[PDB]
Specification:
about 70 residues, mainly alpha, globular, Villin-1, structural protein, helix
């Protein structure tokens, strides 16, 4: 629920895992979204998202190509 270095949504969605920027964990792409992008993509706070059951977090990310 802790925002890390920001990267554009397109970089996170269209880049192969091994080609992602230093420090970007492919399994935690949402933490690299800007606050604006996070709100636009998920429509909830990061804390709210992190408190969702894992299956829901994954399903939401899958629908957005962020899993």
């Amino acid at each position: 629920p802790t925002k890390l270095e920001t990267f554009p949504l397109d970089v996170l969605v269209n880049t192969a895992a091994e080609d992602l920027p230093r420090g970007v964990d492919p399994s935690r792409k949402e933490n690299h979204l800007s606050d604006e992008d996070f709100k636009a993509v998920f429509g909830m706070t990061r804390s709210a998202f992190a408190n969702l059951p894992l299956w829901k977090q994954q399903n939401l990310k899958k629908e957005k190509g962020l899993f």
